Amino acid sequence: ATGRIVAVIGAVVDVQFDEGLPPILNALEVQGRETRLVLEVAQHLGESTVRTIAMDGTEGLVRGQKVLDSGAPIKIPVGPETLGRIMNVIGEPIDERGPIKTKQFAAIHAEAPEFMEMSVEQEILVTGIKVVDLLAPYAKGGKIGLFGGAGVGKTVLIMELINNVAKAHGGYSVFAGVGERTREGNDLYHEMIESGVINLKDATSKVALVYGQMNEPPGARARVALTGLTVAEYFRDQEGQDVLLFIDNIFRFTQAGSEVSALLGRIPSAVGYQPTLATDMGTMQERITTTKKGSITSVQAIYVPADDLTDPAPATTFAHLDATTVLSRAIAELGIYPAVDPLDSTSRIMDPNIVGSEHYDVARGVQKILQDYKSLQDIIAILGMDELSEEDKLTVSRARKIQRFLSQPFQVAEVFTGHLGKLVPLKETIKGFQQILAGEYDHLPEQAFYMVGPIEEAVAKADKLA
Template sequence: MPSGEGANRGQVLAVRGSVVDGYFPDLLPRINNELRAGTDGQVIIEVANHLDPQVVRGVALTPTRGLARGSDMVDTGHPLLAPVGDRLLGRVVDVFGQAIDGKQELTGGQWRPLRRPPVPLAEQGTTAEVFLTGIKAMDLLAPIERGGKVGLFGGAGVGKTVLITELIRNVVGRHRGVTIFCGIGERSREAEEMYREVQDAGLLDNTVLVFGQMNEPPGSRFRVGHTALTIAEYFRDAESMAAENASRLASMQAAEQNNQDHLGVLGQRYHRRRQQAITEELQDIVSGFETLAKPDRLARKQGWVTT
């Protein structure tokens, strides 16, 4: 937690679940800045809006239990950051880039902001090219465009996750790439099963797993997709600068509801560069009898391929 005379300090004005209002009399924190509140700064908040020249509204990414009106709040002066680089291969991290696999903590190295602009128009690829998945039925009947998007729609137990798993296996095996899997709102059991499957398949050394699970606050699940995409963008940009022709797969499995705007912001960053690209977004829309009756309760699973 930032300390000292130079820190921009404020106070908690109101707490409504994961929504926290803060009062900063001296300097208003910027939108998307990371705020720390509570004892030892254990509550992490992202600024979402400016209510007036001295009041901000933010979304807490950690539990707000014990946070009360008048509690200290400090502006860190920077947005939420995620670690990037080859040091993440074989690791499991959360929305903050903290290791949750019981191995050594990720410290130092390069960190990037979760909120990043999309690829400039001048650097985007313009040629049409088929992305070969290695699954004959898809490549023949429903080919995927490199740099494009594809969706899967179906109820529970019809094989959407199996299809994503096969895509990961085929793309990594064919192109010697890196897999980035992000689970949003998953059950702990599902995350553990995915970890075991990747490990048993011998893909763990080329895989990064990012999880924002069902038991975590909504703010954490809301931003974990940005963490995974930031990591995927690093591999895409590194390959573009090195002018190498390697393939990288990023799969995001989401069970989050009412997140159309959130997915739209992520979608703006799925652009193809001239040499490398986040070439596929797999979006599985999970629907059952209840969700068909109530469209606003649709849950989504989503994934990307970067080449």
């Protein structure tokens, strides 16, 4: 079947066929271009006419050009041969090392796992960061969010989780860059070569990379998160392994659907997004699950626009997560890195059965002394410190050291300040918050608790300022 391009409006191309109307989600091929322009059927308008969405720039299309139906959805090369390579939206090698040679091909638009395939196992994934071990612990095989504004650390943190968790992992890894800096995607490819994760001489590489960046058209950022997902479905289903799935950033999948929803002729909903906003996120996000064959451990990174957590795009992804780490800027101004909100970070496995009865009791004492300090900030700012009680000059004097003890020097931020990266075990971040909540360290200043590892370096710092 061949068709004629009838209307080109931005990044939405219209096509009229004469026989053989292709069904929805089929790919088409445009005839007469130097590169490869591939469309994607999105509607049927009647009078034997479809309406597509283009996956590259539509500069130079004449009304009457010929387009050829492929007969099937977009199929990318998948397998263990795609490890150690880079792939674009339609699965072509963009690393100038030759074609990707596999045996089988998998479509992009696949359906979700059923009800009788969901596994109900819950474990704990110890990371090494003091704030996310204690107050919101991470589960193996479940989704993980990372909320925050623009400039708080949603990528210095996600490159620390790669440095700790994914390097010592035994399974496979998949990175999918949706709408970030292209100079950052060059640095990730050039750090995994020196650290030996990707190897260009033999066949012992452990991570695949998928990339559709911020200089891409809106039709190619709205479909690249389905490509880095379909690569990580082979490593779970047809091999039976434990994978990791880092996506950054997932808000660009939502933003780039609103750019094209105006051109498709729709009535727009609230603050400016598409009407089908929560229908097509649930269709995407219910394909990243731990089923009865393997475990997908997705660590996403979500962007909050204009620091507003009531915006419909970062407030409809809260129903799809197990853990949650809300970053904030007002903590990052004081110099507390990572600037994790302690009273807004939630978790699902926080339960006295799974994590214990000793972990659960110290973690709830920390959220109690930090909430009572938050209710006195309206009075300390007006009437000063000398108007409180005597027992309430101890909630203030202890919460101002737990706040500074939730700071930690990261490993990837060695080139920022020149301090050493520190890692703590889970059994030692329980002991550090007992010897502060009890009152063992009421003879030290607050700045001695600043940017250290475990509790033993806090007393090895207060002897300096003597």
